[PDB]
Amino acid sequence: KVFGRCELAAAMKRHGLDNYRGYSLGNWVCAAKFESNFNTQATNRNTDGSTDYGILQINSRWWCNDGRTPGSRNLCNIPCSALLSSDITASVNCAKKIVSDGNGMNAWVAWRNRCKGTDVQAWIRGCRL
């Protein structure tokens, strides 16, 4: 599923991401915009053999199990497939853990290189929230 900009804002806000660990809603929508382009089924192979999953491109090395990343963890206790559903609940719950791991949203290199320091509030411009 490809979410609309404001549709994803509303789903992220309803799951408690708006100002989670200090990051306004415009941050998380911006992060998803450039990680997946709001597509829940997005996957990308990383060089180290790990795969990135879903709307917030969550990595199989630490966060989920895909059975094909030797020596990795499953800290969110989920099959990576759960990060790809139209229900964003698993992605959101796993993002909360990542964002709490000590480096904030810098865990997402796309946010740090594309959202950090920008006018992120524009990502919620014109949405009923």
CATH number at residue 29: 1.10.530.10
Which is catalytic among the residues 52, 66, 87, 119? 52
Residue numbers belonging to the annotated binding site for substrate: 101
Number of domains in the chain: 1
Shortest CA distance to 61 belongs to which of 50, 46, 53? 50
Method for this entry = X-ray
Q: Is 7 assigned a catalytic role?
A: no
Phi, psi of 118 (to 5 degrees): -90, 175
- Domain range for 101 is 1-129
Q: Is 35 assigned a catalytic role?
A: yes
Residue numbers belonging to the annotated binding site: 101
Distance CA(46)–CA(49), nearest Å, equals: 5
Resolution for the entry shown, Å: 2.5
Packed helices 25-35 and 5-14: angle between N→C axes, nearest 10 degrees? 130
Q: Which long-range contacts (CB under 8 A, 24 or more apart) does 10-13 make?
A: 10/127, 10/128, 10/129, 11/88, 12/88, 12/92, 13/129
Which is catalytic among the residues 35, 48, 66, 87? 35
